[PDB]
Amino acid sequence: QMYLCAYCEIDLDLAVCLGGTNTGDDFELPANLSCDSYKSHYEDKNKINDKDWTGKILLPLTLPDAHNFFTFEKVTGKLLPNESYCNTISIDGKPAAETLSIVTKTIEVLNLNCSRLNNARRKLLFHFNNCARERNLRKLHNLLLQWNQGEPKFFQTTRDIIIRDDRICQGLLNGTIRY
Amino acid sequence: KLIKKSESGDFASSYQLYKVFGSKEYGVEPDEKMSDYFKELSAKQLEGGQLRVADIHLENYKGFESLIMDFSMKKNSTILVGNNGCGKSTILDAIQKGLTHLSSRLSTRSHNGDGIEKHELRKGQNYASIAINYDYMGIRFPMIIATTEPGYEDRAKSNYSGINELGSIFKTAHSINPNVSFPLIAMYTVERANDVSTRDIENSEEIKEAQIWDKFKAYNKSLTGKADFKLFFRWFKELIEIENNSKTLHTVEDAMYSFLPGFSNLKLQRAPLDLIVDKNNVSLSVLQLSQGEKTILALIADIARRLTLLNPNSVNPLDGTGIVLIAAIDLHLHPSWQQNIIPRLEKTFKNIQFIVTTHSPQVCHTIDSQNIWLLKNGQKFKAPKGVRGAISSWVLENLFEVAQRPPEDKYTKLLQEYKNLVFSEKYASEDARKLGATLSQHFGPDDETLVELKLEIEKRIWEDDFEK
Amino acid sequence: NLPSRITKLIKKSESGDFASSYQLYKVFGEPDEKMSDYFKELSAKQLEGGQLRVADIHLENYKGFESLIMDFSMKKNSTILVGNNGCGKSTILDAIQKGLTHLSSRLSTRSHNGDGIEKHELRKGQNYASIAINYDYMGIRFPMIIATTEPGYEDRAKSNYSGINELGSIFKTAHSINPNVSFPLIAMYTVERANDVSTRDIENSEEIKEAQIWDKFKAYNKSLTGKADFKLFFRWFKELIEIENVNSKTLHTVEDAMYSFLPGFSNLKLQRAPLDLIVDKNNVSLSVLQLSQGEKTILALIADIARRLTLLNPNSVNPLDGTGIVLIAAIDLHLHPSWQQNIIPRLEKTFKNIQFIVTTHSPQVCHTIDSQNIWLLKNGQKFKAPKGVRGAISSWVLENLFEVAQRPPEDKYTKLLQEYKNLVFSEKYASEDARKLGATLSQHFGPDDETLVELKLEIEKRIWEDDFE
Numbered sequence A: 001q002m003y004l005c006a007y008c009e010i011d012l013d014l015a016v017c018l019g020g021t022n023t024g025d026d027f028e029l030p031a032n033l034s035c036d037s038y039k040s041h042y043e044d045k046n047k048i049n050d051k052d053w054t055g056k057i058l059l060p061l062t063l064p065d066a067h068n069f070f071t072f073e074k075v076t077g078k079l080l081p082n083e084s085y086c087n088t089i090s091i092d093g094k095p096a097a098e099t100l101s102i103v104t105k106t107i108e109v110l111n112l113n114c115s116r117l118n119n120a121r122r123k124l125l126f127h128f129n130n131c132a133r134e135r136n137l138r139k140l141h142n143l144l145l146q147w148n149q150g151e152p153k154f155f156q157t158t159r160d161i162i163i164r165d166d167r168i169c170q171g172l173l174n175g176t177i178r179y
Numbered sequence B: 001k002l003i004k005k006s007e008s009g010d011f012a013s014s015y016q017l018y019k020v021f022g023s024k025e026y027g028v029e030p031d032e033k034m035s036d037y038f039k040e041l042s043a044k045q046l047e048g049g050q051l052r053v054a055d056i057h058l059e060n061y062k063g064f065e066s067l068i069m070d071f072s073m074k075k076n077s078t079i080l081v082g083n084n085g086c087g088k089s090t091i092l093d094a095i096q097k098g099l100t101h102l103s104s105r106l107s108t109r110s111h112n113g114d115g116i117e118k119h120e121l122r123k124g125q126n127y128a129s130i131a132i133n134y135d136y137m138g139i140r141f142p143m144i145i146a147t148t149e150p151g152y153e154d155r156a157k158s159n160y161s162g163i164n165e166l167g168s169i170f171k172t173a174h175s176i177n178p179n180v181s182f183p184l185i186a187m188y189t190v191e192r193a194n195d196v197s198t199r200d201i202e203n204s205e206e207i208k209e210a211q212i213w214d215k216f217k218a219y220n221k222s223l224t225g226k227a228d229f230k231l232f233f234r235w236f237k238e239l240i241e242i243e244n245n246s247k248t249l250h251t252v253e254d255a256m257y258s259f260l261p262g263f264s265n266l267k268l269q270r271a272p273l274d275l276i277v278d279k280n281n282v283s284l285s286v287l288q289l290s291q292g293e294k295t296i297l298a299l300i301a302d303i304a305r306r307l308t309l310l311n312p313n314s315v316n317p318l319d320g321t322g323i324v325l326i327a328a329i330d331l332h333l334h335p336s337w338q339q340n341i342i343p344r345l346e347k348t349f350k351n352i353q354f355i356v357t358t359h360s361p362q363v364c365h366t367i368d369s370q371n372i373w374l375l376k377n378g379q380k381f382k383a384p385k386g387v388r389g390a391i392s393s394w395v396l397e398n399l400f401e402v403a404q405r406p407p408e409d410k411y412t413k414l415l416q417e418y419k420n421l422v423f424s425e426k427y428a429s430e431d432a433r434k435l436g437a438t439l440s441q442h443f444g445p446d447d448e449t450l451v452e453l454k455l456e457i458e459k460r461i462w463e464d465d466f467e468k
Numbered sequence C: 001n002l003p004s005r006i007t008k009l010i011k012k013s014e015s016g017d018f019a020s021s022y023q024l025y026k027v028f029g030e031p032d033e034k035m036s037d038y039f040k041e042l043s044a045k046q047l048e049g050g051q052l053r054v055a056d057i058h059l060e061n062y063k064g065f066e067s068l069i070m071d072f073s074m075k076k077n078s079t080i081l082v083g084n085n086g087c088g089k090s091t092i093l094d095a096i097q098k099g100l101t102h103l104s105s106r107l108s109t110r111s112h113n114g115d116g117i118e119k120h121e122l123r124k125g126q127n128y129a130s131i132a133i134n135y136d137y138m139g140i141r142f143p144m145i146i147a148t149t150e151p152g153y154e155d156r157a158k159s160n161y162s163g164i165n166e167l168g169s170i171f172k173t174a175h176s177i178n179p180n181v182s183f184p185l186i187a188m189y190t191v192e193r194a195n196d197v198s199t200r201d202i203e204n205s206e207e208i209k210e211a212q213i214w215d216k217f218k219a220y221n222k223s224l225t226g227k228a229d230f231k232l233f234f235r236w237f238k239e240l241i242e243i244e245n246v247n248s249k250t251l252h253t254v255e256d257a258m259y260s261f262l263p264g265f266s267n268l269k270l271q272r273a274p275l276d277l278i279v280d281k282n283n284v285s286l287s288v289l290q291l292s293q294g295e296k297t298i299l300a301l302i303a304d305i306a307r308r309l310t311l312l313n314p315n316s317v318n319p320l321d322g323t324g325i326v327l328i329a330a331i332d333l334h335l336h337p338s339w340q341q342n343i344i345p346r347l348e349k350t351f352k353n354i355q356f357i358v359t360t361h362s363p364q365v366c367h368t369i370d371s372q373n374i375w376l377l378k379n380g381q382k383f384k385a386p387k388g389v390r391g392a393i394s395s396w397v398l399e400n401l402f403e404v405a406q407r408p409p410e411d412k413y414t415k416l417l418q419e420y421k422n423l424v425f426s427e428k429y430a431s432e433d434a435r436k437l438g439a440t441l442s443q444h445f446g447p448d449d450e451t452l453v454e455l456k457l458e459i460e461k462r463i464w465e466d467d468f469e
């Protein structure tokens, strides 16, 4: 994460982005705000005092190299919690019926479903569709080879969810498809 | 054919009969009795007749050489689009003259009108003609307004035959039944809300005289471009005091309630005279409202009053029929309101035609392409396909021709240059990186376009790296 | 005098600067009572190159707002106020207008006088009201407070005018020493700008029948009133052109300023006939009555500003570069979206050293001005515009600054699009419903729409994935 922030995986020029607000120009709309800015707005609005935020916020890197907590509503681009893999896991030691609430609060506190972020990660679906237009299994294999390479790049969580929820990509990764 | 067209429950059919018994149709048997019968039936059951403008033709009225524009007959909205000075209000003014001549028949305010003034003739020519046509339940009633310059009188002559017959029809209908609906000839301009106020309203001529509320005075001050708020106040004072037909006030109130989101409980103030409205449990006066709210207030009040006066003893006064002309229907409105002003009008004032002029695309991605006319270089051009549910940028670039991104700006030329660098062999050049950083620092690292450009850059990195 | 800061200030004061000379003027006045006079002389003599701006305003009970402490920028000369119909845009402009009236009564027009907060201008159910405006000139903050208290509560605020009086004192001192000196233009324009642009019965009516004096003063007459004096401009135009036998270069610099806004006009010439003004529109000579409303407004708005600037500037080479607090309201009025994208930049390029605080209901005017110079008033509160409103598509500005959807929200062909999208991205792709709605949408929008082709790409991929499996 040398040039990448934890909450939303955008490319920066714990590093966190500007959150749609340059420096600290105040009187900003609390709907374009994400990451740290909307977190501070939430803190001010709901009068929360404990600012540790460790235990109710799960970020992609600290998780055991897993991203199955998150779905991907492709109609809007929202990252949404998954009933499966959240009702079957516990984090830091808790009942298994609270990981869902941890994920939901993390989405709500950080506000990762901003229209800006949704319309941004919506374009990765377009780019992945354009490769699967000529129906050439070599270019799609190449797309997966570049998207599942080291040094995680811009939006490297949806870049993995998209490959997850596919039958050609998963089959080609497994071995049942040979190009 | 003659036996087939004989109808007992239709006047549209029983007007061709009047034209047959006579001459000019087939040279058929003339008489003075069957003509009387089928002229009596011509105006006796005119329920559901929508008076509409069929087509127009211009000769040299202001800046035009020739223009033949046909208006819609199914959709009740027409929008005119053009640049500044592309003759949009010229068509409105020609139709206004036609409506002034249509008036004075059923208004009975003499038989005057509005001819073409010398300053309205096209610069450097000797004749002009505003040929206007109409339609009332099928039949077409024409008009020609002629204006010459001496020595050239053999080019155009006024006719006024169609309105001379149509006013005869309506006058006969009224003479038969006093409780008959009448069409609206409303006309509104950019000087609409120039009178909305209650200052010195007690000594004004509006509240000074015994105004007669009937079905022929509703056309007074209609073809001028101003909505008389003071006469509305006079009407409201009578409807709120004589109560001590309650639907007359209720129906009028429950359309201004629809157009104004959060206004309720209009009440007279018998203190220094003013009108009191409640904006979210806060009592407010007319002077304390905003310009757009007052504009919609005056417009809707004017239509409601002029249409409840025209349809006495009805159950749904605000249906009627009429030809209402509105110039700059997007005047002093927020784009949230310039997205529902038209459908709201057509839900409230259904059976009324609206030939409106607009300067905004928000009011244009709500109307079908076939009901939008674009004026350019003195000629008509129809709108492109797919405008009713289109993104505002597409409408802007295809009907209001303008670049969706400022042609003269430091961040549009830079964007286009950055795209040119990206979609070339120098995508990784230092200049491309510098311009990309410059655009990201301003539009944000997460803009929709820059993500696509970065994706293409990554793809080309990979393609120049697996073959190298 | 301490030879640490007083000497440092006088070092720059002797070099020539209004702010530097004024810095010690208030300091001296142990009082000396003569250093104050010398510093006042130096300051009044050194008002060259000044620029008058409004810095900040503050309202307490003025028509709906219960608290508002907005401030204006100084690095850019255009601040656009955006909001819903009836939130705060006209109220703020009126609040500024009251202060500009109280300042115009002290710069040139007569003496101490102005307008206060009327009873109908105080928010319902309250007992006090205040309009606090702070001015800036050459780097000095002159305060001003207008107060209005209902009976029994005459202790919350008292109207203090302790900055405008001194600003007018400095300006009268400058005018006494040098008759030839520029003064700050103060103008107000409402939705009622183009209601008196008509050369009908000009000879019979006033402004022709009465002798008019074009002094440097009196150029502020009827400036904070809305309507623009186009008829006085006609008199000014006639008492020039007819005085061609100055009187040439003034009209040259006004004509080339009015022609920059109107792409194809030329040859502004008077007509000695039943009086009227004649313009040329692409080799077609026609009158002001024969122009368009959209062009008449842009004629009357800028000709008046040019006339006032020439009147206030005595002998400057460029009389249209002074200083001003013009407050054009609804600048997007009667303009095509093609002119709405140049109205502001053209105004800033022509009237360079003029501040405009305008109101706008159109994204076309908005997406040419940075976010830092746009104020949004949603409920009762000031919100700064989102990042990136210079060089952006009109639809993004519409959604993210106007809270209006790109597509209509209650259309039949827009509620079908979302159902089509839901069917496409669900497991019911390539179904009879997904083809019926797809065919309807393709017929309506043509088989080239940007969204529909992307949905076709998605359905193509899914067909591929279920065929090769």
Ligand SMILES: Nc1ncnc2c1ncn2[C@@H]1O[C@H](COP(=O)(O)OP(=O)(O)OP(=O)(O)O)[C@@H](O)[C@H]1O
Binding pocket: B061, B062, B063, B082, B083, B084, B085, B086, B087, B088, B089, B090, B091, B119, B120, B121, B122, B123, C281, C284, C286, C290, C291, C292, C293, C294, C295, C334, C335
């Ligand atoms: N008698 C005439 N001779 C020559 N040209 C004329 C004459 N009358 C009008 N014109 C031209 O035609 C135009 C008038 O058209 P009009 O005022 O209706 O424009 P508009 O588009 O409706 O108004 P807006 O700019 O507000 O949208 C003017 O630009 C003028 O130049």
Ligand SMILES: Nc1ncnc2c1ncn2[C@@H]1O[C@H](COP(=O)(O)OP(=O)(O)OP(=O)(O)O)[C@@H](O)[C@H]1O
Binding pocket: B279, B282, B284, B288, B289, B290, B291, B292, B293, B332, C062, C063, C064, C083, C084, C085, C086, C087, C088, C089, C090, C091, C092, C120, C121, C122, C123, C124
């Ligand atoms: N004395 C008052 N008491 C309570 N509320 C008031 C008072 N005066 C004004 N208001 C409220 O504040 C609004 C004033 O509208 P204003 O013209 O200042 O804003 P606007 O943005 O310019 O609207 P528009 O563009 O449509 O003209 C009104 O809608 C009214 O509701």
Ligand SMILES: [Zn+2]
Binding pocket: A005, A006, A007, A008, A009, A010, A016, A017, A019, A034, A035
């Ligand atoms: Zn981030």
